[PDB]
């Protein structure tokens, strides 16, 4: 079964920053690699469908890259709604398999 | 209005195809002068925006099925066509009804004076 | 809009069996199978559980390290999904959720508020 | 034979008894038949996976379609397979047939066994791919990729030389039916499952260098599990 | 354990054509790079080679007589074969069907036919 | 509109189709798991209702009188349609002239208010 | 070329210039082009006719056409006929051809003759039908069933099991043709008219029977008039 | 609109054609009794009205080039129709649009009372 | 691909993003895809302009479309050309091609050269005319006459019976290739250019009159400038 990571465990961030995660798995032809965070107190929200499309009603601020083994999310600017955990999956058949996640810490 | 099927949809579509607008050259035209036989085709990448491609995936798979049995009842060996008489039904769906605004058909702009 | 609610959570015994379910309407179940998930501050989200569509004639799945431990059952005239835990051992004490999608996407579309479960 | 429309950025059946102007095909240019790559369901690719998918059948006549261009394949398939008598199996390909544009890795197998019935043809029904028309069997020869075909209503080199993996049949269309790897005019390794073109490619690692290489009047099979590879392991 | 039997074409007029055949009762050669051959041994003379076949479809000739010699199979019946083009005195010879023995390594054949001889007249 | 010619016409129509609606299993979509090749046939029976099958009998000899001509102007070898082309001249007969309502055509729907 | 229109529950001729909504074509599937025997005209079916109705022509090539499904035939013909120098006669038929799906009685000539010409031809131009495709010329083997085709508007083993009647024929193609039944290895019976299939099954009440059965090194002819039979008449 | 290439235009058009109607006879209609097989052709003349023959040489090259590249992308043999599918789309080109009057389409005939 | 438009008694180009009712398609029958004759441009039909003009390409494939009836040509060719080994060299028509029907000065042509490549090829892509189907390569034996094809909207035996000039090829396909004149098995004249084919008819004034006509046991070839005949000056 194909395995996951991600790095790095948690970010400091400040308002406006330019942020990416890095996310490493077992190989995986397919682009089935998706996004999504949760908050405190909150079920996980997806960020973007699977390879980049992003989910709907998220902001455009929102990106990410790569295919196989190695893949990342990228967020162009920070708003403080942002604030939250993030993670990774692997939705490439079955079983699913789910990145540790990162947290997004402040500065 | 369809969703996939358990096996596992790869969203990416890497593609080729044979189209070509115009020439390079006119020469380009000219067989003789023209690309090596695998030279037409020419490829290209989407991605799947809005579940397009997956949908594409169960989409294909249902009209293979259709398919199967349609050219089972083709007499025809080769079946370069279809797509055509499909155009032809398109067309026959929307005509030789009865239709001035009443019938719920032929998109008739609202009426001004 | 997935109106999707949860139940049958909360303390239990170790050593017991409980049918966690849920509800959900506004998203017919014949498009779609379902998922289980569970989480905890010492795990992170994992998968549990897959429940295939009628069309696959309801194939199930389970993570490895917890198969055989559970069932599912969905009803698709309630629009209801059933855990149906064989066991309740230990270690099962995670927040639990249920999931559906677009087929052209994946399930992790949609979510529960999740519920929490837990083993004495 | 329903046709897939793009309307509201999402595909939606053409099977309806209204059809609302909202969706318009103002040419046809816009119509599109456009095969697709099976192998992008996530079906094995494993070459005995092959051919328990194809039927041998001996009956109902072959047919083909036309269809538009479409994706690219990982993996194809080339075939010589004969009957055990020498007979040949398989018509030659009809004229205008030749192989799929951009298979990555094109297989080719030869060798024989029953090879029951005329027309093979597959059990799924999938259609074989050649170039640009679909088929319901088989030919000599040339790279058919295994596909399905849909219809729906519009709003360097490497990319072909890439191929490689030729090897041996032992039997064939039945059960029994083993196949051998070959390099170097060398007849090796089971190929029984698991394997990706690339790891079979990595054991060309010992191709005039860490092993096997029989310097010998014959060729010597190694029978896969250095271990891997099966050195010296034969018989 | 494997009753190869040998045959063959019968007296024949020297610059004739000879026809040889052997088949192996007790397998089905269906194993993949299993060996087949033949060599002759004319007057009580050592084991001259002639010809190699192999179950994955390869042909080997002794290049002196290969102008005039071609292999032959058929595997339904367990059956291998020579033909020899200008057959004359110098191709009288005792002649015999081979197979690989220890199978799979080295050849190690090995496997012997019960022996056949030819003439001409 | 036509009448029979001195031959003489049987009123049964005893005939047989390749035509078949669905399939009894999905396995039946598959030409491997296909019925025999005389299989695809279906049969039925119809009756001279109206004089139809016997009409039929006299279109079709003044049919095959028109079509052998058209076959001898044709280029290609098997003719696989027609049926389309005469669908595309049935369109064509309605359209592409002037059509409000004073044209007599386009069946257009008395107007209301 | 004039299409069938039904409506007002009747035919129609579609060669009008108005053509009245009162007709639709909601879909291509209303069209049809069926074909219809001829022998549903009361054409004669005796052997000796059929021959008559076949031209011999050389000259123009042949041409075919597709077309629907259509009624049973009770009689259809089978053919080998060949030159007196030993030459075939006729070309052997095209890929997709198949004898016509439904036939009661198909009947088998052999023999040889003058068979002049290379492409046949109806005399009256009507088409053969083998399976769905119409044809202006008589393919070697394979049964064509007499017919012609219409166009219209629209709105168990025996069904093909059932065969009998294989003979020879004296000469082809011109009115000193003559054909003699046969069964069992016998030549026998001129057929000269008035035979319906039934009635040369009748005959058969003599195979191993009650008559002929020529129990000796050689067959022997019987000349029709036991005294249909002509036991004994042979010359 | 076009005009002519450096080419030498011969105003001339001399030409044959298979179209034949009717028949002399009704044995005619058997090829059978049919003409020889070069029998079919049947021929005319026409001059350089408007400088129509011209213009038409001029038009052929332009559509043999645009043709040759067609013809590079089809995957059928012997394309024996073209002019099929160019009729489709001069419907296309006037159909499915909402059309009351408004639109600058389907030729609506003024309207009385 | 643009279609002319026959309106305003002009011709007009089809290409244009509205179509005006006036120009009005009321049956098939006013489409024609009229085929035209490349010598109608004043095209120079030496043939050695006529060998010029072709590729000799080796690669693609061959196609082929239908197309409506067309005007006659004064020049067509028939080909015989066959590689220097003896090999065959262009394949043989296809089923269904014949001559052209109107050509008053089939040239036909025989003998050998490199004849490089396998499908010919026009060097202008201008098509090849066999009866009814154009044609982008040559076929063997039989009359294509160099025209191209225009598709437009629209609102006695000498006419097939005339044909002279036979001749040999050196060399084909080729800078160096060379044709002489042949009649009366006698192998003669460079045909260097100039020569319309009443001009070579002309010289047929020598045959068995005036000139020529070797009566020996072989035949002698006249270098063409009596200066003409260039009688005696055959090296
Ligand atoms: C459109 O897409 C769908 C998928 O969305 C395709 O559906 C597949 O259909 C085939 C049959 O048509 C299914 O294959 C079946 O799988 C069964 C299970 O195999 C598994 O279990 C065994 C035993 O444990 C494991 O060893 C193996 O690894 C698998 O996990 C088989 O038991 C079935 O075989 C029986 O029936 C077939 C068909 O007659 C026989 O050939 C067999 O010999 C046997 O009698 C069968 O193979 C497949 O699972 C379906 N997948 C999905 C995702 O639905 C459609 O095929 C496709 N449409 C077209 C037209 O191609
Ligand atoms: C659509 O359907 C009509 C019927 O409705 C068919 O019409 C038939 O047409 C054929 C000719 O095309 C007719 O056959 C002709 O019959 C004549 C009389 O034969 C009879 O008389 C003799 C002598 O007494 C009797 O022995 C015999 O039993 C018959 O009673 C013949 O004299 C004609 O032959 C001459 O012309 C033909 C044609 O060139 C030659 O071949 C002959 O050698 C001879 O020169 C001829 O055979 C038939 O009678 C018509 N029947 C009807 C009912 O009209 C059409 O054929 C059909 N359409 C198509 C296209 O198939
Ligand atoms: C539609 O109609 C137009 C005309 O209206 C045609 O156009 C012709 O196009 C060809 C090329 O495609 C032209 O031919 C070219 O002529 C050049 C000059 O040749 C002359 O000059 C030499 C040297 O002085 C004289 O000996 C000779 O007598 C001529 O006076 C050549 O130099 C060109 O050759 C170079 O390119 C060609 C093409 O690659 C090579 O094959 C040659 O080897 C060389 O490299 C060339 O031959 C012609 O002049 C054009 N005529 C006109 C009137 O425009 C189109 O061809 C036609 N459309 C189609 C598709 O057929
Ligand atoms: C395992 O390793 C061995 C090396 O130990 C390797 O053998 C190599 O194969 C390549 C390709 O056959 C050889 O390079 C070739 O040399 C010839 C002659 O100069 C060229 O013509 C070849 O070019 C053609 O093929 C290329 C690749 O498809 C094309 O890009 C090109 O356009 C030509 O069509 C090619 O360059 C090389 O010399 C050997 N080397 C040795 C030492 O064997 C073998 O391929 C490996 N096994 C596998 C299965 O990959
Ligand atoms: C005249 O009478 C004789 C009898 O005196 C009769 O001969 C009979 O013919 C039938 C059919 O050939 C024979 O029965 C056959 O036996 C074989 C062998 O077991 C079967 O394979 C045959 O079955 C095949 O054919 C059937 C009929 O088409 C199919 O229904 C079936 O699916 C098979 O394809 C068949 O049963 C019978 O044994 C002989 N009997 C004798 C004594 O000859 C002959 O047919 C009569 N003449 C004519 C022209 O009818
Ligand atoms: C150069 O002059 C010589 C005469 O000095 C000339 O030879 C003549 O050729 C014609 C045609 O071949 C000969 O007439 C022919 O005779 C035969 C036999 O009777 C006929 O079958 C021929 O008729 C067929 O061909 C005709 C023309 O195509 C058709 O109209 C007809 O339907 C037939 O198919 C034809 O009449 C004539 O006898 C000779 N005369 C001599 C003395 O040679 C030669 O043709 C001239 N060279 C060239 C290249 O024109
Ligand atoms: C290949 O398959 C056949 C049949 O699938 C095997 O023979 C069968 O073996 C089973 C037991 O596994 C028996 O119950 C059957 O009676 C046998 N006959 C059948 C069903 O064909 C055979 O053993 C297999 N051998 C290999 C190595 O492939
Ligand atoms: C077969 O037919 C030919 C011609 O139809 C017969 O020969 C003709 O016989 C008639 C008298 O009936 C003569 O007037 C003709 O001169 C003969 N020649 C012709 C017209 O071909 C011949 O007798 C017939 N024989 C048989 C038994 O069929
Ligand atoms: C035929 O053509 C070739 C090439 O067109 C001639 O050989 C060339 O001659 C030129 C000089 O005219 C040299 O500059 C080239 O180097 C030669 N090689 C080439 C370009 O192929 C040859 O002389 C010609 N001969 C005849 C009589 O046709
Ligand atoms: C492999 O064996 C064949 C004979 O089967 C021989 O022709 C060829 O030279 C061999 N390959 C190499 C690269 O030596
Ligand atoms: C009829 O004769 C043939 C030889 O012409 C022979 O092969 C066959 O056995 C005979 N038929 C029967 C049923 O004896
Ligand atoms: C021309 O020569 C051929 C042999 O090449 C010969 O058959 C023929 O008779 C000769 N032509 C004439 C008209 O003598």
């Known amino acids: 079964d194909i395995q996951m990571t991600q790095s790095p465990a948690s970010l400091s961030v400040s308002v406006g920053e330019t942020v990416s995660i890095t996310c490493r798995a077992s190989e995986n032809i397919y682009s089935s690699l998706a996004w999504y965070q949760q908050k405190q107190g909150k079920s996980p929200q997806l960020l973007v469908y699977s390879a980049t499309i992003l989910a709907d009603g998220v902001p455009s601020r929102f990106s990410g890259s790569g295919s196989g083994t190695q893949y990342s999310l990228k967020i162009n600017s920070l708003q403080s709604e942002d604030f939250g955990t993030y993670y990774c999956q692997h939705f490439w058949g079955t079983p699913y398999t789910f990145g540790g996640g990162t947290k997004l810490e402040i500065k | 209005a369809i969703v996939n099927a358990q096996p596992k949809c790869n969203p990416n579509l890497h593609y080729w195809t044979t189209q070509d607008e115009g020439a390079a050259i006119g020469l380009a035209w000219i067989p003789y002068f023209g690309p090596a036989a695998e030279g037409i085709y020419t490829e290209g990448l989407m991605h799947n925006q809005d579940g397009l491609i997956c949908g594409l995936r169960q989409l294909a798979n249902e009209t293979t099925q259709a398919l199967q049995l349609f050219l089972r009842a083709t007499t025809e060996l080769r079946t370069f066509s279809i797509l055509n008489r499909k155009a032809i039904d398109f067309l026959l769906q929307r005509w030789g009804g009865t239709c001035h605004i009443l019938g719920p058909d032929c998109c008739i702009e609202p009426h001004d004076w | 809009e997935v109106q999707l609610q949860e139940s049958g959570g909360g303390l239990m015994q170790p050593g017991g069996s409980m049918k966690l379910s849920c509800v959900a309407s506004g998203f017919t179940f014949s498009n779609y199978w379902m998922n289980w998930v569970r989480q905890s501050p010492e795990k992170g989200l994992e998968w549990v559980a897959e429940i295939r569509l009628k069309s696959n004639n309801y194939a199930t799945h389970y993570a490895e390290s917890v198969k055989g431990r559970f069932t599912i059952s969905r009803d698709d005239s309630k629009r209801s999904v059933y855990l149906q835990m064989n066991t309740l051992r230990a270690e099962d004490t995670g927040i639990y959720y249920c999931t559906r999608g677009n087929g052209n996407y994946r399930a992790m579309d949609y979510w529960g508020q999740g519920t929490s479960v837990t083993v004495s | 034979i329903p046709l897939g429309v793009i309307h509201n950025s999402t595909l939606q059946v053409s099977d309806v008894d209204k059809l609302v102007c909202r969706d318009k095909l103002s040419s046809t240019n816009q119509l599109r038949s456009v095969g697709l790559n099976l192998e992008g369901n996530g079906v094995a690719t494993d070459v005995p996976s092959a051919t328990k998918r194809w039927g041998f059948r001996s009956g109902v006549p072959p047919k083909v379609v036309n269809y538009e261009a479409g994706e690219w394949a990982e993996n194809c398939y080339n075939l010589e397979i004969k009957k055990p008598d020498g007979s040949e199996c398989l018509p030659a390909a009809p004229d205008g047939i030749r192989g799929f544009p951009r298979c990555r890795y094109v297989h080719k197998v030869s060798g024989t066994g029953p090879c029951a019935g005329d027309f093979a043809f597959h059990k799924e029904g999938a259609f074989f791919l050649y170039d640009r028309l679909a088929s319901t069997v088989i030919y000599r020869g040339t790279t058919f990729a295994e596909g399905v075909v849909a219809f729906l209503i519009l709003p360097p080199s490497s990319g072909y030389y890439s191929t490689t993996i030729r090897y041996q049949a032992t039997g064939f269309g039945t059960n029994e039916t083993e196949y051998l790897f070959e390099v170097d005019n060398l007849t090796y390794v089971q190929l029984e499952s698991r394997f990706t073109p690339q790891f079979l490619l990595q054991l060309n690692e010992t191709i005039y260098t860490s092993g096997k290489r029989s310097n010998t009047t014959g060729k010597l099979i190694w029978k896969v599990n250095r271990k891997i590879r099966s050195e010296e392991l034969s018989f | 354990d494997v009753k190869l039997l040998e045959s063959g074409g019968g007296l024949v007029q020297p610059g004739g054509s000879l026809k040889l055949s052997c088949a192996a009762s007790?397998?089905?050669?269906?194993?993949?790079?299993?060996?087949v051959g033949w060599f002759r041994q004319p007057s009580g003379k050592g084991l001259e080679w002639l010809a190699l076949?192999?179950?994955?479809?390869?042909?080997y000739y002794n290049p002196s007589l290969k102008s005039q010699l071609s292999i032959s199979k058929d595997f339904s019946r367990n059956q291998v074969f020579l033909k020899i083009s200008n057959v004359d005195i110098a191709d009288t010879a005792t002649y015999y069907c081979?197979?690989?023995?220890?199978?799979?390594?080295?050849?190690?054949?090995?496997?012997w036919g019960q022996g056949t001889s030819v003439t001409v007249s | 509109a036509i009448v029979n010619a001195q031959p003489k016409c049987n009123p049964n129509l005893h005939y047989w189709t390749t035509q078949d609606e669905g399939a009894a299993i999905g396995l039946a979509w598959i030409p491997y798991f296909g019925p025999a090749a005389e299989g695809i046939y279906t049969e039925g029976l119809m009756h001279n209702q109206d004089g139809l099958i016997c009409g039929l009998r006299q279109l079709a000899n003044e049919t095959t009188q028109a079509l052998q001509l058209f076959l001898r102007a044709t280029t290609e070898l098997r003719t696989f349609s027609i049926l389309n082309r005469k669908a595309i001249d049935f369109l064509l007969q309605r359209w592409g002239g002037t059509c409000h309502i004073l044209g007599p055509d386009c069946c257009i729907e008395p107007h209301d208010w | 070329i004039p299409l069938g229109v039904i409506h007002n529950s009747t035919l129609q001729v579609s060669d009008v210039d108005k053509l009245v909504c009162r007709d639709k074509l909601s879909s291509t599937n209303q069209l049809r082009s069926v074909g219809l025997n001829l022998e549903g005209n009361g054409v004669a079916t005796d052997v000796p006719s059929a021959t008559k109705r076949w031209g011999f022509r050389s000259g123009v090539p042949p041409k075919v056409v597709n077309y629907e499904a259509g009624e049973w035939a009770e009689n259809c013909y089978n053919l080998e006929i060949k030159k007196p120098d030993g030459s075939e006669c006729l070309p052997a038929a095209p890929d997709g051809i198949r004898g016509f799906p439904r036939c009661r009685y198909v009947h088998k000539v052999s023999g040889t003759g003058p068979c002049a010409g290379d492409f046949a031809f109806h005399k009256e131009g009507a088409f053969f039908l083998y399976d769905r495709l119409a044809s202006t010329v008589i393919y070697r083997g394979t049964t064509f069933a007499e017919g012609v085709v219409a166009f219209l508007i629209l709105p168990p083993s025996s069904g093909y099991y059932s065969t009998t009647i294989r003979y020879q024929a004296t000469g082809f193609g011109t009115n000193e043709t003559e054909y003699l039944f046969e069964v069992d290895n016998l030549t026998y019976v001129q057929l000269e008219s008035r035979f319906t299939p039934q009635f040369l099954l009748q005959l058969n009440e003599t195979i191993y029977t009650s008559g002929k059965r020529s129990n000796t090194t050689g067959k022997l002819i019987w000349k029709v008039n036991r005294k249909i039979r002509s036991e004994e008449l042979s010359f | 609109a076009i005009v002519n290439a450096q080419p030498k235009c011969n105003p001339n058009l001399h030409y044959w054609t298979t179209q034949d109607e009717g028949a002399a006879i009704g044995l005619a209609w058997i090829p059978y009794f049919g003409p020889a097989a070069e029998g079919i052709y049947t021929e005319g003349l026409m001059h350089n009205q408007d400088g129509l023959i011209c213009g038409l040489r001029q038009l052929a090259n332009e559509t043999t080039q645009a043709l040759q590249l067609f013809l590079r992308a089809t995957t059928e043999l012997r394309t024996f129709s073209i002019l099929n599918r160019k009729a489709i789309d001069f419907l296309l080109q006037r159909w499915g649009g909402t059309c009351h009057i408004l639109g600058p389409d389907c030729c609506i005939e003024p309207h009385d009372w | 691909i643009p279609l002319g438009v026959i309106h305003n008694s002009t011709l007009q180009v089809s290409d244009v993003d509205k179509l005006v009712c006036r120009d009005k398609l009321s049956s098939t029958n006013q489409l024609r895809s009229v085929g035209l004759n490349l010598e109608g441009n004043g095209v120079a039909t030496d043939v050695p302009s006529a060998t010029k003009r072709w590729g000799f390409r080796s690669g693609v494939p061959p196609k082929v479309v239908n197309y409506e009836a067309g005007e006659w040509a004064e020049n067509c060719y028939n080909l015989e050309i066959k590689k220097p080994d003896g090999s065959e060299c262009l394949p043989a028509a296809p089923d269904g091609i014949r001559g052209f029907p109107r050509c008053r000065y089939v040239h036909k042509v025989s003998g050998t050269g490199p004849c490089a490549g396998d499908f010919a090829f026009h060097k202008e892509g201008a098509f090849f005319l066999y009866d009814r189907l154009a044609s982008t390569v040559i076929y063997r034996g039989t009359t294509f006459a160099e025209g191209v094809v225009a598709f437009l909207i629209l609102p006695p035996s000498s006419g097939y019976y005339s044909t002279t000039i036979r001749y040999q090829a050196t060399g084909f396909g080729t800078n160096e290739t060379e044709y002489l004149f042949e009649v009366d098995n006698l192998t003669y004249v460079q045909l260097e250019s100039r020569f319309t084919p009443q001009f070579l008819l002309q010289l047929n004034e020598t045959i068995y009159t005036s000139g020529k006509r070797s009566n020996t046991t072989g035949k002698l070839i006249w270098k063409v400038n009596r200066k003409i005949r260039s009688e005696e000056l055959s090296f």
């Open positions: 081979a197979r690989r023995d220890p199978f799979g390594y080295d050849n190690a054949m090995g496997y």
């Open positions: 007790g397998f089905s050669l269906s194993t993949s790079g299993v060996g």
């Open positions: 076949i192999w179950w994955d479809d390869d042909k």
